[PDB]
Design a protein around this motif. Sequence first.
Motif, PDB file in Angstrom:
ATOM      1  N   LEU A  44     -15.402 -81.753 -44.270  1.00 24.50           N
ATOM      2  CA  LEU A  44     -14.471 -82.806 -44.658  1.00 24.50           C
ATOM      3  C   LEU A  44     -13.043 -82.273 -44.780  1.00 24.50           C
ATOM      4  CD1 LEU A  44     -16.681 -84.693 -47.315  1.00 24.50           C
ATOM      5  CD2 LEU A  44     -16.256 -85.368 -44.904  1.00 24.50           C
ATOM      6  N   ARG A  46     -10.496 -78.652 -46.603  1.00 26.19           N
ATOM      7  CA  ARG A  46     -10.343 -77.426 -47.391  1.00 26.19           C
ATOM      8  C   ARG A  46      -9.343 -77.584 -48.539  1.00 26.19           C
ATOM      9  NH1 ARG A  46      -8.292 -76.458 -41.789  1.00 26.19           N
ATOM     10  NH2 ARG A  46      -9.023 -74.352 -41.255  1.00 26.19           N
ATOM     11  N   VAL A  52     -14.924 -78.006 -48.245  1.00 26.89           N
ATOM     12  CA  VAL A  52     -15.715 -79.144 -48.700  1.00 26.89           C
ATOM     13  C   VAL A  52     -16.389 -79.839 -47.505  1.00 26.89           C
ATOM     14  CG1 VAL A  52     -13.655 -79.550 -50.199  1.00 26.89           C
ATOM     15  CG2 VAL A  52     -14.891 -81.556 -49.284  1.00 26.89           C
ATOM     16  N   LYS A  67     -18.596 -78.930 -52.484  1.00 20.60           N
ATOM     17  CA  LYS A  67     -17.384 -78.115 -52.610  1.00 20.60           C
ATOM     18  C   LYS A  67     -17.839 -76.674 -52.791  1.00 20.60           C
ATOM     19  CE  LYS A  67     -13.287 -78.071 -55.623  1.00 20.60           C
ATOM     20  NZ  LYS A  67     -12.893 -78.284 -57.033  1.00 20.60           N
ATOM     21  N   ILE A  94     -14.919 -88.791 -61.264  1.00 20.28           N
ATOM     22  CA  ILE A  94     -15.906 -88.335 -60.273  1.00 20.28           C
ATOM     23  C   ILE A  94     -17.126 -87.740 -61.007  1.00 20.28           C
ATOM     24  CG2 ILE A  94     -14.907 -85.975 -59.860  1.00 20.28           C
ATOM     25  CD1 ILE A  94     -16.361 -88.334 -57.013  1.00 20.28           C
ATOM     26  N   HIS A 114     -20.550 -89.086 -53.631  1.00 21.45           N
ATOM     27  CA  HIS A 114     -19.731 -89.355 -52.451  1.00 21.45           C
ATOM     28  C   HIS A 114     -18.914 -90.630 -52.645  1.00 21.45           C
ATOM     29  CE1 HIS A 114     -18.836 -90.912 -48.404  1.00 21.45           C
ATOM     30  NE2 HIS A 114     -18.681 -89.625 -48.076  1.00 21.45           N
ATOM     31  N   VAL A 115     -17.637 -90.613 -52.241  1.00 22.45           N
ATOM     32  CA  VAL A 115     -16.767 -91.795 -52.276  1.00 22.45           C
ATOM     33  C   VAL A 115     -16.334 -92.078 -50.834  1.00 22.45           C
ATOM     34  CG1 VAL A 115     -14.685 -92.941 -53.219  1.00 22.45           C
ATOM     35  CG2 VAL A 115     -15.984 -91.335 -54.659  1.00 22.45           C
ATOM     36  N   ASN A 117     -13.910 -92.910 -48.938  1.00 19.35           N
ATOM     37  CA  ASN A 117     -12.454 -92.981 -49.005  1.00 19.35           C
ATOM     38  C   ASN A 117     -11.798 -93.568 -47.762  1.00 19.35           C
ATOM     39  OD1 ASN A 117      -9.847 -92.265 -50.499  1.00 19.35           O
ATOM     40  ND2 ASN A 117      -9.656 -90.713 -48.903  1.00 19.35           N
ATOM     41  N   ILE A 173     -10.576 -87.237 -58.777  1.00 14.94           N
ATOM     42  CA  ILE A 173     -11.332 -86.038 -58.400  1.00 14.94           C
ATOM     43  C   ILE A 173     -10.571 -84.758 -58.655  1.00 14.94           C
ATOM     44  CG2 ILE A 173     -12.581 -87.462 -56.654  1.00 14.94           C
ATOM     45  CD1 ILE A 173     -11.127 -85.335 -54.468  1.00 14.94           C
ATOM     46  N   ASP A 174     -11.225 -83.644 -58.276  1.00  8.23           N
ATOM     47  CA  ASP A 174     -10.741 -82.266 -58.309  1.00  8.23           C
ATOM     48  C   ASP A 174     -10.118 -81.865 -59.630  1.00  8.23           C
ATOM     49  OD1 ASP A 174     -10.259 -79.629 -57.696  1.00  8.23           O
ATOM     50  OD2 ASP A 174      -9.651 -80.093 -55.613  1.00  8.23           O
TER      51      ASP A 174
HETATM   52  C1  LIG Z   1     -14.487 -81.554 -54.438  1.00 14.21           C
HETATM   53  C2  LIG Z   1     -12.995 -81.660 -54.525  1.00 14.21           C
HETATM   54  O1  LIG Z   1     -12.440 -82.318 -55.391  1.00 14.21           O
HETATM   55  N1  LIG Z   1     -12.324 -81.035 -53.535  1.00 14.21           N
HETATM   56  C3  LIG Z   1     -11.717 -81.600 -52.396  1.00 14.21           C
HETATM   57  C4  LIG Z   1     -12.279 -82.758 -51.854  1.00 14.21           C
HETATM   58  C5  LIG Z   1     -11.885 -83.210 -50.598  1.00 14.21           C
HETATM   59  N2  LIG Z   1     -12.429 -84.389 -50.033  1.00 14.21           N
HETATM   60  C6  LIG Z   1     -13.332 -85.376 -50.442  1.00 14.21           C
HETATM   61  C7  LIG Z   1     -13.741 -86.416 -49.568  1.00 14.21           C
HETATM   62  C8  LIG Z   1     -14.561 -87.437 -50.014  1.00 14.21           C
HETATM   63  N3  LIG Z   1     -14.997 -88.534 -49.239  1.00 14.21           N
HETATM   64  C9  LIG Z   1     -14.798 -88.624 -47.793  1.00 14.21           C
HETATM   65  C10 LIG Z   1     -14.746 -89.961 -47.172  1.00 14.21           C
HETATM   66  C11 LIG Z   1     -13.515 -89.144 -47.284  1.00 14.21           C
HETATM   67  N4  LIG Z   1     -14.964 -87.367 -51.326  1.00 14.21           N
HETATM   68  N5  LIG Z   1     -15.781 -88.256 -51.967  1.00 14.21           N
HETATM   69  C12 LIG Z   1     -15.868 -87.786 -53.205  1.00 14.21           C
HETATM   70  C13 LIG Z   1     -15.121 -86.622 -53.401  1.00 14.21           C
HETATM   71  C14 LIG Z   1     -14.557 -86.338 -52.164  1.00 14.21           C
HETATM   72  N6  LIG Z   1     -13.740 -85.328 -51.719  1.00 14.21           N
HETATM   73  C15 LIG Z   1     -10.971 -82.464 -49.862  1.00 14.21           C
HETATM   74  C16 LIG Z   1     -10.448 -81.291 -50.385  1.00 14.21           C
HETATM   75  C17 LIG Z   1     -10.824 -80.814 -51.645  1.00 14.21           C
HETATM   76  C18 LIG Z   1     -10.265 -79.517 -52.176  1.00 14.21           C
END
Ligand SMILES: CC(=O)Nc1cc(Nc2cc(NC3CC3)n3nccc3n2)ccc1C
Length: 331
Positions: A44, A46, A52, A67, A94, A114-115, A117, A173-174
Amino acid sequence: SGPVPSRARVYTDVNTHRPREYWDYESHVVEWGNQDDYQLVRKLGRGKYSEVFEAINITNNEKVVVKILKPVKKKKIKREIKILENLRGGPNIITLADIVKDPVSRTPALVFEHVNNTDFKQLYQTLTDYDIRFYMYEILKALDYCHSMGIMHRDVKPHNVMIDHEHRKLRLIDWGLAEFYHPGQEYNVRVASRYFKGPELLVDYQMYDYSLDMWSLGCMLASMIFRKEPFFHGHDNYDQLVRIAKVLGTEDLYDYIDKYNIELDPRFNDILGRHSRKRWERFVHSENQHLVSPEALDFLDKLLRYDHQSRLTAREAMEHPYFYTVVKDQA
Ligand SMILES: CC(=O)Nc1cc(Nc2cc(NC3CC3)n3nccc3n2)ccc1C
Protein backbone atom coordinates in the motif's frame (compact mmCIF):
# COMPACT_ATOMS: atom_id res chain seq x y z
CA SER A 1 16.65 32.95 32.23
CA GLY A 2 14.71 29.79 31.27
CA PRO A 3 11.21 29.56 29.71
CA VAL A 4 7.97 30.04 31.71
CA PRO A 5 6.36 26.59 32.41
CA SER A 6 2.95 25.69 30.92
CA ARG A 7 0.18 23.21 31.73
CA ALA A 8 -2.67 21.88 29.61
CA ARG A 9 -5.85 23.99 30.12
CA VAL A 10 -7.96 20.74 30.09
CA TYR A 11 -7.40 17.00 30.96
CA THR A 12 -4.28 18.16 32.89
CA ASP A 13 -4.01 15.34 35.47
CA VAL A 14 -5.89 12.46 33.82
CA ASN A 15 -2.68 10.26 33.66
CA THR A 16 -1.66 11.08 37.27
CA HIS A 17 -5.14 9.77 38.35
CA ARG A 18 -4.57 6.52 36.43
CA PRO A 19 -2.52 3.46 37.63
CA ARG A 20 1.20 3.77 36.50
CA GLU A 21 0.62 0.86 33.94
CA TYR A 22 -1.78 2.98 31.84
CA TRP A 23 1.03 5.38 30.71
CA ASP A 24 4.31 3.67 31.83
CA TYR A 25 4.79 2.05 28.39
CA GLU A 26 8.51 1.14 29.01
CA SER A 27 7.26 -1.60 31.35
CA HIS A 28 4.51 -2.74 28.87
CA VAL A 29 4.81 -6.39 27.75
CA VAL A 30 3.69 -6.93 24.13
CA GLU A 31 0.95 -9.61 23.51
CA TRP A 32 1.87 -11.52 20.29
CA GLY A 33 -0.58 -13.16 17.87
CA ASN A 34 0.14 -15.76 15.16
CA GLN A 35 1.94 -14.44 12.08
CA ASP A 36 0.54 -17.46 10.03
CA ASP A 37 -3.00 -16.03 10.39
CA TYR A 38 -2.03 -13.35 7.83
CA GLN A 39 -1.13 -13.58 4.15
CA LEU A 40 0.08 -10.40 2.47
CA VAL A 41 -1.93 -9.40 -0.65
CA ARG A 42 -0.09 -6.26 -1.92
CA LYS A 43 1.91 -3.18 -0.90
CA LEU A 44 0.00 0.00 0.00
CA GLY A 45 2.95 2.30 0.71
CA ARG A 46 5.74 3.28 3.11
CA GLY A 47 6.50 5.51 6.11
CA LYS A 48 9.56 6.75 8.00
CA TYR A 49 9.61 3.64 10.24
CA SER A 50 7.53 1.12 8.15
CA GLU A 51 6.28 -0.72 4.96
CA VAL A 52 2.48 -1.17 4.87
CA PHE A 53 0.57 -3.91 3.08
CA GLU A 54 -2.97 -5.10 2.55
CA ALA A 55 -3.37 -8.64 3.94
CA ILE A 56 -5.95 -11.34 4.46
CA ASN A 57 -6.61 -12.89 7.87
CA ILE A 58 -6.96 -16.54 6.69
CA THR A 59 -8.92 -17.58 9.92
CA ASN A 60 -11.92 -15.24 9.28
CA ASN A 61 -11.33 -14.10 5.61
CA GLU A 62 -11.18 -10.44 6.75
CA LYS A 63 -9.15 -7.75 4.93
CA VAL A 64 -6.56 -6.07 7.23
CA VAL A 65 -3.73 -3.50 6.92
CA VAL A 66 -0.27 -4.73 8.04
CA LYS A 67 2.37 -2.17 9.13
CA ILE A 68 5.76 -3.97 9.19
CA LEU A 69 8.21 -1.88 11.24
CA LYS A 70 11.74 -0.79 10.25
CA PRO A 71 14.25 -0.80 13.24
CA VAL A 72 12.66 1.41 15.94
CA LYS A 73 13.45 1.61 19.68
CA LYS A 74 11.50 -1.05 21.61
CA LYS A 75 10.10 1.63 24.01
CA LYS A 76 8.64 3.58 20.98
CA ILE A 77 6.95 0.34 19.70
CA LYS A 78 5.58 -0.27 23.24
CA ARG A 79 4.34 3.36 23.32
CA GLU A 80 2.36 3.07 20.00
CA ILE A 81 0.92 -0.36 21.07
CA LYS A 82 -0.02 0.98 24.55
CA ILE A 83 -1.65 4.11 23.11
CA LEU A 84 -3.60 1.96 20.52
CA GLU A 85 -4.77 -0.50 23.20
CA ASN A 86 -5.79 2.43 25.50
CA LEU A 87 -7.82 4.14 22.70
CA ARG A 88 -9.43 0.94 21.35
CA GLY A 89 -13.18 1.37 20.83
CA GLY A 90 -12.86 5.18 20.98
CA PRO A 91 -14.82 7.22 18.34
CA ASN A 92 -13.08 7.30 14.92
CA ILE A 93 -9.85 5.79 16.38
CA ILE A 94 -8.23 3.15 14.10
CA THR A 95 -8.51 -0.35 15.66
CA LEU A 96 -5.32 -2.30 16.32
CA ALA A 97 -6.46 -5.93 15.62
CA ASP A 98 -3.18 -7.81 16.26
CA ILE A 99 0.61 -7.69 16.77
CA VAL A 100 2.82 -10.32 15.11
CA LYS A 101 6.60 -10.84 14.69
CA ASP A 102 7.54 -10.81 10.93
CA PRO A 103 9.74 -13.89 9.99
CA VAL A 104 11.90 -12.22 7.28
CA SER A 105 12.40 -8.84 9.06
CA ARG A 106 12.20 -10.35 12.65
CA THR A 107 10.51 -6.98 13.45
CA PRO A 108 6.97 -6.41 14.75
CA ALA A 109 4.13 -5.99 12.30
CA LEU A 110 1.03 -4.14 13.58
CA VAL A 111 -2.27 -5.42 12.17
CA PHE A 112 -5.05 -2.84 11.73
CA GLU A 113 -8.71 -2.66 10.73
CA HIS A 114 -8.90 -1.90 6.96
CA VAL A 115 -10.41 1.44 5.80
CA ASN A 116 -11.50 1.69 2.11
CA ASN A 117 -9.87 5.13 1.70
CA THR A 118 -10.74 7.59 -1.08
CA ASP A 119 -7.28 9.25 -1.76
CA PHE A 120 -7.22 12.83 -0.29
CA LYS A 121 -5.69 14.32 -3.53
CA GLN A 122 -8.96 13.20 -5.32
CA LEU A 123 -11.54 13.29 -2.44
CA TYR A 124 -10.87 16.91 -1.26
CA GLN A 125 -11.65 18.37 -4.77
CA THR A 126 -15.20 16.81 -4.49
CA LEU A 127 -16.08 17.74 -0.83
CA THR A 128 -18.97 20.21 -0.28
CA ASP A 129 -19.23 22.80 2.57
CA TYR A 130 -21.31 20.25 4.59
CA ASP A 131 -18.73 17.39 4.01
CA ILE A 132 -15.84 19.52 5.43
CA ARG A 133 -17.93 20.42 8.55
CA PHE A 134 -19.02 16.76 8.87
CA TYR A 135 -15.53 15.29 8.64
CA MET A 136 -14.01 18.07 10.81
CA TYR A 137 -16.59 17.17 13.52
CA GLU A 138 -15.62 13.44 13.16
CA ILE A 139 -11.85 14.30 13.59
CA LEU A 140 -12.82 16.36 16.72
CA LYS A 141 -14.59 13.29 18.23
CA ALA A 142 -11.26 11.33 17.91
CA LEU A 143 -9.18 14.28 19.29
CA ASP A 144 -11.48 15.03 22.24
CA TYR A 145 -11.44 11.31 23.01
CA CYS A 146 -7.63 10.81 22.83
CA HIS A 147 -7.03 14.10 24.80
CA SER A 148 -9.60 13.00 27.48
CA MET A 149 -7.57 9.76 27.60
CA GLY A 150 -4.33 11.77 28.26
CA ILE A 151 -2.86 11.32 24.78
CA MET A 152 -1.57 13.88 22.18
CA HIS A 153 -1.54 12.48 18.56
CA ARG A 154 1.28 14.94 17.46
CA ASP A 155 0.99 13.97 13.77
CA VAL A 156 -2.48 15.22 12.67
CA LYS A 157 -2.40 15.78 8.85
CA PRO A 158 -4.60 14.68 5.82
CA HIS A 159 -2.53 11.49 5.22
CA ASN A 160 -3.35 10.32 8.82
CA VAL A 161 -7.11 10.71 8.27
CA MET A 162 -8.61 7.73 6.37
CA ILE A 163 -12.00 8.48 4.87
CA ASP A 164 -14.41 5.88 3.40
CA HIS A 165 -16.65 8.60 1.77
CA GLU A 166 -19.29 6.11 0.44
CA HIS A 167 -19.88 4.97 4.08
CA ARG A 168 -19.06 8.47 5.61
CA LYS A 169 -16.52 6.64 7.83
CA LEU A 170 -13.45 8.39 9.22
CA ARG A 171 -10.49 6.92 11.20
CA LEU A 172 -7.55 8.83 12.68
CA ILE A 173 -4.53 6.59 12.05
CA ASP A 174 -0.78 6.28 12.67
CA TRP A 175 -0.31 6.78 16.39
CA GLY A 176 3.47 6.20 15.97
CA LEU A 177 4.30 9.77 17.16
CA ALA A 178 1.58 9.92 19.88
CA GLU A 179 2.58 10.56 23.54
CA PHE A 180 0.99 10.59 27.00
CA TYR A 181 0.54 14.12 28.40
CA HIS A 182 2.19 14.71 31.80
CA PRO A 183 2.15 18.21 33.43
CA GLY A 184 5.69 19.65 33.48
CA GLN A 185 7.07 17.17 30.90
CA GLU A 186 9.33 18.56 28.16
CA TYR A 187 8.67 16.81 24.84
CA ASN A 188 10.73 16.37 21.68
CA VAL A 189 9.88 19.29 19.29
CA ARG A 190 11.09 17.20 16.23
CA VAL A 191 7.58 15.78 15.64
CA ALA A 192 4.90 16.28 12.88
CA SER A 193 5.27 17.03 9.17
CA ARG A 194 6.76 20.47 8.34
CA TYR A 195 3.47 22.05 7.18
CA PHE A 196 1.48 20.99 10.28
CA LYS A 197 4.11 21.91 12.94
CA GLY A 198 2.80 24.24 15.67
CA PRO A 199 4.68 27.52 16.45
CA GLU A 200 5.69 25.89 19.86
CA LEU A 201 7.69 23.24 17.84
CA LEU A 202 9.24 25.88 15.55
CA VAL A 203 10.42 28.08 18.48
CA ASP A 204 11.61 25.01 20.50
CA TYR A 205 9.06 25.40 23.36
CA GLN A 206 9.12 21.86 24.84
CA MET A 207 6.37 22.06 27.53
CA TYR A 208 3.53 21.67 25.03
CA ASP A 209 0.26 19.67 25.28
CA TYR A 210 -2.93 18.46 23.48
CA SER A 211 -3.30 22.02 21.99
CA LEU A 212 -0.52 21.13 19.47
CA ASP A 213 -3.10 18.86 17.68
CA MET A 214 -5.48 21.85 17.45
CA TRP A 215 -2.91 23.87 15.42
CA SER A 216 -2.50 20.84 13.05
CA LEU A 217 -6.30 20.65 12.69
CA GLY A 218 -6.44 24.39 11.84
CA CYS A 219 -3.82 23.86 9.06
CA MET A 220 -6.00 21.03 7.63
CA LEU A 221 -9.18 23.21 7.83
CA ALA A 222 -7.39 26.16 6.12
CA SER A 223 -6.13 23.82 3.31
CA MET A 224 -9.67 22.38 2.80
CA ILE A 225 -11.80 25.60 2.80
CA PHE A 226 -9.27 27.64 0.74
CA ARG A 227 -8.29 24.69 -1.54
CA LYS A 228 -4.61 25.61 -0.80
CA GLU A 229 -2.41 22.60 0.00
CA PRO A 230 -0.30 23.12 2.03
CA PHE A 231 -1.69 26.29 3.63
CA PHE A 232 1.65 27.30 5.33
CA HIS A 233 4.27 26.30 2.71
CA GLY A 234 7.71 26.57 4.38
CA HIS A 235 11.00 25.69 2.62
CA ASP A 236 12.38 24.35 5.97
CA ASN A 237 11.49 24.57 9.73
CA TYR A 238 12.81 28.19 10.01
CA ASP A 239 10.93 29.37 6.85
CA GLN A 240 7.85 27.47 8.13
CA LEU A 241 7.53 30.03 11.02
CA VAL A 242 8.12 32.89 8.47
CA ARG A 243 5.10 31.54 6.38
CA ILE A 244 2.95 31.57 9.58
CA ALA A 245 4.18 35.11 10.56
CA LYS A 246 3.24 36.48 7.09
CA VAL A 247 -0.41 35.47 7.88
CA LEU A 248 -0.71 35.75 11.72
CA GLY A 249 1.62 38.76 11.94
CA THR A 250 4.94 39.18 13.79
CA GLU A 251 3.44 41.25 16.70
CA ASP A 252 1.43 38.33 18.21
CA LEU A 253 4.49 36.07 17.61
CA TYR A 254 6.84 38.37 19.60
CA ASP A 255 4.10 38.71 22.30
CA TYR A 256 3.96 34.87 22.48
CA ILE A 257 7.85 34.71 22.68
CA ASP A 258 7.81 37.35 25.47
CA LYS A 259 4.95 35.69 27.46
CA TYR A 260 6.82 32.32 27.72
CA ASN A 261 10.34 33.88 27.95
CA ILE A 262 11.36 31.82 24.88
CA GLU A 263 14.93 32.41 23.66
CA LEU A 264 14.64 32.62 19.84
CA ASP A 265 17.28 30.85 17.71
CA PRO A 266 19.54 33.74 16.37
CA ARG A 267 18.85 32.51 12.76
CA PHE A 268 15.19 33.65 13.17
CA ASN A 269 16.13 37.34 13.86
CA ASP A 270 17.12 38.16 10.24
CA ILE A 271 14.36 36.12 8.50
CA LEU A 272 11.15 36.79 10.54
CA GLY A 273 11.05 40.49 9.65
CA ARG A 274 7.93 42.57 10.31
CA HIS A 275 4.53 41.48 9.03
CA SER A 276 0.97 42.60 9.69
CA ARG A 277 -1.78 40.10 10.57
CA LYS A 278 -3.71 39.37 7.38
CA ARG A 279 -7.47 39.04 6.90
CA TRP A 280 -8.72 35.57 5.81
CA GLU A 281 -10.45 37.23 2.80
CA ARG A 282 -7.19 37.43 0.79
CA PHE A 283 -7.25 33.59 0.43
CA VAL A 284 -10.90 33.61 -0.81
CA HIS A 285 -11.50 33.39 -4.58
CA SER A 286 -14.19 32.22 -7.08
CA GLU A 287 -13.01 28.55 -6.86
CA ASN A 288 -13.21 28.21 -3.00
CA GLN A 289 -15.92 30.78 -1.88
CA HIS A 290 -18.64 28.02 -1.68
CA LEU A 291 -16.59 26.40 1.19
CA VAL A 292 -15.84 29.69 3.04
CA SER A 293 -18.42 31.31 5.35
CA PRO A 294 -18.14 33.74 8.35
CA GLU A 295 -18.56 30.63 10.66
CA ALA A 296 -15.60 28.82 8.97
CA LEU A 297 -13.35 31.92 9.36
CA ASP A 298 -14.30 32.56 13.01
CA PHE A 299 -13.61 28.85 13.84
CA LEU A 300 -10.29 28.88 11.84
CA ASP A 301 -9.05 32.06 13.62
CA LYS A 302 -9.74 30.43 17.04
CA LEU A 303 -7.56 27.40 16.14
CA LEU A 304 -4.58 29.18 14.57
CA ARG A 305 -3.12 31.05 17.57
CA TYR A 306 0.64 31.21 18.38
CA ASP A 307 -0.23 30.88 22.07
CA HIS A 308 -1.21 27.20 22.52
CA GLN A 309 -3.17 28.11 25.75
CA SER A 310 -5.51 30.40 23.75
CA ARG A 311 -6.48 27.81 21.01
CA LEU A 312 -9.90 26.09 21.28
CA THR A 313 -9.91 22.65 22.92
CA ALA A 314 -11.44 19.84 20.80
CA ARG A 315 -14.60 20.05 23.05
CA GLU A 316 -14.92 23.89 22.67
CA ALA A 317 -14.34 23.44 18.88
CA MET A 318 -17.32 20.96 18.72
CA GLU A 319 -19.61 23.69 20.27
CA HIS A 320 -18.70 26.26 17.55
CA PRO A 321 -21.58 27.60 15.25
CA TYR A 322 -19.70 26.12 12.20
CA PHE A 323 -21.02 22.66 13.35
CA TYR A 324 -24.67 23.62 14.30
CA THR A 325 -26.28 21.77 11.29
CA VAL A 326 -23.94 18.71 11.63
CA VAL A 327 -24.82 18.48 15.42
CA LYS A 328 -28.62 18.94 14.66
CA ASP A 329 -28.48 16.25 11.86
CA GLN A 330 -26.67 13.83 14.23
CA ALA A 331 -29.63 14.18 16.73
C1 LIG B 1 -0.44 1.75 9.69
C2 LIG B 1 -0.16 3.21 9.51
O1 LIG B 1 -0.79 4.07 10.12
N1 LIG B 1 0.77 3.50 8.59
C3 LIG B 1 0.58 3.97 7.27
C4 LIG B 1 -0.58 3.58 6.59
C5 LIG B 1 -0.69 3.79 5.22
N2 LIG B 1 -1.86 3.42 4.51
C6 LIG B 1 -3.11 2.87 4.84
C7 LIG B 1 -4.06 2.54 3.84
C8 LIG B 1 -5.32 2.08 4.19
N3 LIG B 1 -6.34 1.75 3.28
C9 LIG B 1 -6.14 1.66 1.83
C10 LIG B 1 -7.29 1.88 0.94
C11 LIG B 1 -6.21 2.89 1.03
N4 LIG B 1 -5.57 1.95 5.53
N5 LIG B 1 -6.74 1.51 6.09
C12 LIG B 1 -6.52 1.58 7.40
C13 LIG B 1 -5.25 2.07 7.72
C14 LIG B 1 -4.63 2.29 6.49
N6 LIG B 1 -3.38 2.74 6.15
C15 LIG B 1 0.38 4.34 4.52
C16 LIG B 1 1.54 4.68 5.19
C17 LIG B 1 1.69 4.48 6.57
C18 LIG B 1 2.98 4.83 7.27
